[PDB]
Amino acid sequence: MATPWSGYLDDVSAKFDTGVDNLQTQVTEALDKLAAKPSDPALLAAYQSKLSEYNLYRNAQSNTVKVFKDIDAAIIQNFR
Amino acid sequence: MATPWSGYLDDVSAKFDTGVDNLQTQVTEALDKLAAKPSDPALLAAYQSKLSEYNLYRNAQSNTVKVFKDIDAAIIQNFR
Amino acid sequence: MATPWSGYLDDVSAKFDTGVDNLQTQVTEALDKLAAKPSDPALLAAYQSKLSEYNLYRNAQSNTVKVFKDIDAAIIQNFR
Amino acid sequence: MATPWSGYLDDVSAKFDTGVDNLQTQVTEALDKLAAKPSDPALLAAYQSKLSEYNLYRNAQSNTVKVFKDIDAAIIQNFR
Amino acid sequence: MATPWSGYLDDVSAKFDTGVDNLQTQVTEALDKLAAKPSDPALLAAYQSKLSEYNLYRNAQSNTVKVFKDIDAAIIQNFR
Amino acid sequence: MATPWSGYLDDVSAKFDTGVDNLQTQVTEALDKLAAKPSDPALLAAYQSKLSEYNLYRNAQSNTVKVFKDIDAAIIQNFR
Amino acid sequence: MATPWSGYLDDVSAKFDTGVDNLQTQVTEALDKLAAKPSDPALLAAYQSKLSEYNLYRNAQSNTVKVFKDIDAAIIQNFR
Amino acid sequence: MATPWSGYLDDVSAKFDTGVDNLQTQVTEALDKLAAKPSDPALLAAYQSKLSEYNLYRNAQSNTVKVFKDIDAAIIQNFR
Amino acid sequence: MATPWSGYLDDVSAKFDTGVDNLQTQVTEALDKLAAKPSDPALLAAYQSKLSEYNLYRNAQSNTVKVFKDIDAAIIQNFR
Amino acid sequence: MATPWSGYLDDVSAKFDTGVDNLQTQVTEALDKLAAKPSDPALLAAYQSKLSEYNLYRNAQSNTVKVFKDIDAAIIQNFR
Amino acid sequence: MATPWSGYLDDVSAKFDTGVDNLQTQVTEALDKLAAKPSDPALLAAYQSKLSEYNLYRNAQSNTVKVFKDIDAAIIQNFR
Amino acid sequence: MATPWSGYLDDVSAKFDTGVDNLQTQVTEALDKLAAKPSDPALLAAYQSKLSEYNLYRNAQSNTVKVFKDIDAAIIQNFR
Amino acid sequence: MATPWSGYLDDVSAKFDTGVDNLQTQVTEALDKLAAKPSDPALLAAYQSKLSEYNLYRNAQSNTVKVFKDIDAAIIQNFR
């Protein structure tokens, strides 16, 4: 019944991850397989393709949170 | 009813493969046959011809995905 | 009769895209064809030529919007 | 109604073979006959004459495909 | 009355092709004939001579476009 | 009698171009000729030699303007 | 009972090596044997085949670690 | 129950050898016999015929592995 | 009285050609004569000897210009 | 009696050039001679050897000046 | 008690030579004898047989060292 | 009794060189000998083997120092 | 009393030539004699033997200088 506290920026992170929740799992499993056969073109292409997206999984995630935090700073900058 | 998640760059990879989905199968079967008779001019010519295309199956595939990812980086570079 | 809201920077994006609205379609169709025959010099040259322009379709687009936003920040920086 | 996939370089191979589709059959039948009477000057001359052409059936074939693939590499070398 | 959109780099490609528009046709027809008689010295010499030029038809074409795109990048690199 | 407005940085661009006003024309005409005969060593050498200079026609041009703009920013940074 | 400290990127390296832990041993033993008889086609083929994989044992290993470190930098880049 | 590790390129080597696993044995036994009677036309013809195939047993084998490794390099070349 | 514009790299090209201005003419005339009698040992030796130098007439020419352009890039790389 | 003004970074450039004042002259004269006989191994070796040093004549020169300018920026960055 | 320093690639060279340490001596002594009687079929066969192996004594040696150095470069290429 | 001043990065350079202090001497002496007999396979193999290590003597040396300097910059970047 | 300036890479060239200063003279004199009697086995053997070494007089010379220049580039690549 209890629910851990989550702020707005927390929610923003969740909102982004919602659409790419599977992305992490896919690229992780692609890594797991590729580790067994690094020389597999199929595993290389699949992993790298999903990894270039996983790059934004972290980058774009933190970027959007920053901006939503930046508009927070903008408001409290005028906190008369 | 469920469908695995696929990003834009994932879709780009699929879009390329769509037109050369058979290419992989053809050159694989050509390899399978050539393995039996490597000294067959017919199997050599067919396999090598389709293999020189299969070279782009991987190369050109990853190239187009990179570019579509590069314009992604270009945009988020200006992520004010 | 109703018209979706559009800001100045929105208009700037539209103004850029206006002159290259077809560019996206051309390079997309070039990709669609190239996918079928990646090994076609004609499709490679056409696609890559239009793709190097499509690079600016995203890059230069976001660049001009940034600048028009930067002069916005410059003004409100002096928002006494 | 269905048609097996064929790339550009595949088409190049077909384009060459089109003009020498019979060459293979002729030199094969010449071999078949010569096998029966290797000591026949007529079969030797005919077979060897068509065989020296069959030499290009494979050589020149793969050469032209290579070049058309080489200009493919040239283009994607500048795949910015 | 309508005219398909063409960018600067598109125009650059056209400008190059303008002077060698016939080159492609000549070497294609040379291939078509050579396919019929690969063992013809006349067709071999003519085709190969025009093919060594057709090598630049693709290579030099993409090279000049790259450079004109490179000076584009150079400018927008200073896009303050 | 009327003269279009030109700023300092505009003048800087003009000052650079003044010394290489012909450069653009020379390399353009070299391109025009080379397009006709790409396989001409003379046209290749002349064009490429002037093109490597034309590289700076754009690069160095925008570089000097940037710097003169950078010292502008430096001054107005202290615009008390 | 004690366990040496290992970071995430350390774990990433281990995760890759897990699937190719034997690869190193195989190619090392192949080298050891080949050293005795360099002129053995069997040892050459086996060693070189496993060596071309061992190329990725180091290359692909460090590549994946870099990327996982790159997304680390991406996050701390927004470390407000 | 245990199985030695094998990569993709390892599998490629095996896939080729699968179709010519007997080739090695045949030409080896042909050598063994020929060694006893080098002057036997039957042993010379049989051995040399199978040896010219054994030439590809090594050559074509390593060639196909190289290519499958080359497309591996192509992918990781774009390992952003 | 008027003199066409020439840059530094233009001057570099001229400086090289200065010492081999005659080389081009000599090997061209050697070609003209050889064309009449290709089977002349004297024309073959003279032409080929001067042609192997004419190889550098283009190669070494463009090489030195590149380097002088490379040190140009090196400087403007530090164009603070 | 009059002496042209020279700043610190000017002095830095002079300090570097002091030790390689002759380098420029040597490689220039080597070029002058090589231009006459490009096919001379002695002129090629001497010129190229001194040219690879002349590469640093410009590169390393501008590098050291940059650094001495960078520590200038570092100081005035704290110009309270 | 003192031991000269040896790097990894040094060790790699030693590891190869270990298995063919005698090869050099054998082919050297075969040369020494053959020098006395070049026309000896026995010395020719023995020397040439061991010389064709001595070919790899140098070639394959440097090849393996290169590769082990290449994976060194691969790692330090990602030396963030 | 007096000791020249040495910073941390100085110590880092020394720490690296400590393990390869002999490397420089070995490859220098190998060069000295090779200069006398460049055509000696033994001197070529030894020198080149130690030279490929000497490549890192400079490269890897400066790399590690850079990184230790980079973490210095990282700290003083937060020098509040 | 005056001594022409010489850089490190200059010294490297000299260091190599030191051990083969006579090589050039020997093979030059061998050429001079051979020119008189090209059909002399003694002059052919002597000249060709020293010429195959003179091949490295230029090749190996420039190779070692390149490497010593390459480690120069490696250092200044980290010229922070």
Tab-separated table of N, CA, C and O in Angstrom, chain I residues 74-75 78 80, chain J residues 8-17 20 56-72, chain M residues 76 79-80:
chain	number	residue	atom	x	y	z
I	74	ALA	N	47.178	23.441	-39.983
I	74	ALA	CA	47.784	23.362	-38.660
I	74	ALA	C	47.732	24.708	-37.949
I	74	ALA	O	47.465	24.778	-36.749
I	75	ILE	N	47.989	25.776	-38.697
I	75	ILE	CA	48.014	27.119	-38.131
I	75	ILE	C	46.613	27.583	-37.750
I	75	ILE	O	46.391	28.073	-36.643
I	78	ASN	N	44.795	26.495	-34.709
I	78	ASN	CA	45.033	27.252	-33.486
I	78	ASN	C	44.591	28.702	-33.640
I	78	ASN	O	45.132	29.597	-32.991
I	80	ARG	N	42.796	31.089	-32.551
I	80	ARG	CA	42.014	31.526	-31.402
I	80	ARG	C	41.420	32.910	-31.633
I	80	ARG	O	40.427	33.033	-32.295
J	8	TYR	N	54.745	39.672	-26.220
J	8	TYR	CA	55.317	38.467	-25.631
J	8	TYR	C	55.150	37.269	-26.557
J	8	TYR	O	56.103	36.533	-26.812
J	9	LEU	N	53.935	37.079	-27.058
J	9	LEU	CA	53.641	35.965	-27.952
J	9	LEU	C	54.403	36.095	-29.264
J	9	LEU	O	54.817	35.097	-29.854
J	10	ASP	N	54.586	37.331	-29.716
J	10	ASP	CA	55.513	37.619	-30.804
J	10	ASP	C	56.916	37.122	-30.479
J	10	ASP	O	57.573	36.501	-31.314
J	11	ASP	N	57.368	37.400	-29.261
J	11	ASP	CA	58.688	36.967	-28.818
J	11	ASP	C	58.775	35.448	-28.748
J	11	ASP	O	59.810	34.861	-29.062
J	12	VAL	N	57.681	34.816	-28.334
J	12	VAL	CA	57.610	33.362	-28.284
J	12	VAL	C	57.787	32.753	-29.670
J	12	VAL	O	58.527	31.785	-29.844
J	13	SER	N	57.103	33.328	-30.654
J	13	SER	CA	57.254	32.904	-32.040
J	13	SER	C	58.694	33.063	-32.512
J	13	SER	O	59.241	32.182	-33.175
J	14	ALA	N	59.303	34.192	-32.164
J	14	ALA	CA	60.691	34.455	-32.525
J	14	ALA	C	61.634	33.475	-31.838
J	14	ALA	O	62.606	33.012	-32.436
J	15	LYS	N	61.341	33.161	-30.581
J	15	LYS	CA	62.181	32.261	-29.800
J	15	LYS	C	62.223	30.870	-30.421
J	15	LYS	O	63.279	30.241	-30.487
J	16	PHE	N	61.069	30.395	-30.875
J	16	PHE	CA	60.990	29.124	-31.586
J	16	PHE	C	61.735	29.188	-32.912
J	16	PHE	O	62.552	28.319	-33.219
J	17	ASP	N	61.451	30.223	-33.696
J	17	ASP	CA	62.028	30.356	-35.028
J	17	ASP	C	63.543	30.502	-34.960
J	17	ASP	O	64.257	30.094	-35.876
J	20	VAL	N	65.241	27.363	-35.541
J	20	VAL	CA	64.913	26.743	-36.819
J	20	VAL	C	64.797	27.786	-37.923
J	20	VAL	O	64.094	27.580	-38.913
J	56	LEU	N	56.676	20.811	-38.360
J	56	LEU	CA	56.642	21.313	-36.991
J	56	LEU	C	57.032	22.784	-36.934
J	56	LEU	O	56.641	23.505	-36.017
J	57	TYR	N	57.808	23.223	-37.919
J	57	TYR	CA	58.141	24.636	-38.059
J	57	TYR	C	56.896	25.507	-37.971
J	57	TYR	O	56.941	26.620	-37.443
J	58	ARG	N	55.784	24.997	-38.490
J	58	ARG	CA	54.516	25.715	-38.442
J	58	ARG	C	53.632	25.196	-37.315
J	58	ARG	O	53.061	25.977	-36.553
J	59	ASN	N	53.523	23.876	-37.215
J	59	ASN	CA	52.625	23.252	-36.251
J	59	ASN	C	53.060	23.547	-34.821
J	59	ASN	O	52.325	24.168	-34.053
J	60	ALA	N	54.261	23.099	-34.470
J	60	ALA	CA	54.771	23.256	-33.113
J	60	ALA	C	54.909	24.729	-32.745
J	60	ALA	O	54.693	25.114	-31.595
J	61	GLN	N	55.272	25.547	-33.726
J	61	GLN	CA	55.354	26.990	-33.529
J	61	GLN	C	54.039	27.549	-33.000
J	61	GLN	O	54.007	28.206	-31.959
J	62	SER	N	52.956	27.286	-33.723
J	62	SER	CA	51.648	27.823	-33.367
J	62	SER	C	51.118	27.181	-32.091
J	62	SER	O	50.329	27.784	-31.364
J	63	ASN	N	51.557	25.956	-31.824
J	63	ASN	CA	51.129	25.231	-30.634
J	63	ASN	C	51.646	25.898	-29.367
J	63	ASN	O	50.894	26.119	-28.418
J	64	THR	N	52.936	26.219	-29.358
J	64	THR	CA	53.566	26.828	-28.192
J	64	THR	C	53.010	28.222	-27.931
J	64	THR	O	52.820	28.620	-26.782
J	65	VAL	N	52.753	28.961	-29.005
J	65	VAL	CA	52.158	30.288	-28.897
J	65	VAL	C	50.752	30.216	-28.316
J	65	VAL	O	50.378	31.026	-27.468
J	66	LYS	N	49.976	29.242	-28.777
J	66	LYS	CA	48.639	29.009	-28.243
J	66	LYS	C	48.677	28.805	-26.735
J	66	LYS	O	47.898	29.409	-25.997
J	67	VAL	N	49.587	27.950	-26.280
J	67	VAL	CA	49.677	27.606	-24.866
J	67	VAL	C	50.036	28.823	-24.024
J	67	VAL	O	49.460	29.044	-22.958
J	68	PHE	N	50.992	29.608	-24.507
J	68	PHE	CA	51.394	30.833	-23.825
J	68	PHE	C	50.275	31.867	-23.844
J	68	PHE	O	50.199	32.728	-22.967
J	69	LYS	N	49.408	31.776	-24.847
J	69	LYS	CA	48.207	32.600	-24.898
J	69	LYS	C	47.111	32.032	-24.006
J	69	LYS	O	46.277	32.773	-23.483
J	70	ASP	N	47.117	30.715	-23.835
J	70	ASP	CA	46.108	30.044	-23.025
J	70	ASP	C	46.285	30.366	-21.546
J	70	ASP	O	45.308	30.524	-20.815
J	71	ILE	N	47.537	30.462	-21.113
J	71	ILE	CA	47.845	30.850	-19.741
J	71	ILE	C	47.610	32.340	-19.524
J	71	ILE	O	47.416	32.788	-18.395
J	72	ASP	N	47.628	33.100	-20.613
J	72	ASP	CA	47.194	34.492	-20.582
J	72	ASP	C	45.698	34.597	-20.317
J	72	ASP	O	45.260	35.383	-19.477
M	76	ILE	N	52.961	15.733	-29.474
M	76	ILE	CA	52.331	17.032	-29.675
M	76	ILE	C	50.826	16.891	-29.866
M	76	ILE	O	50.086	17.872	-29.790
M	79	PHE	N	49.583	17.902	-26.680
M	79	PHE	CA	50.190	19.181	-26.329
M	79	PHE	C	49.170	20.118	-25.695
M	79	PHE	O	48.765	21.111	-26.300
M	80	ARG	N	48.758	19.797	-24.473
M	80	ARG	CA	47.728	20.566	-23.786
M	80	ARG	C	48.228	21.959	-23.427
M	80	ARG	O	48.247	22.823	-24.260
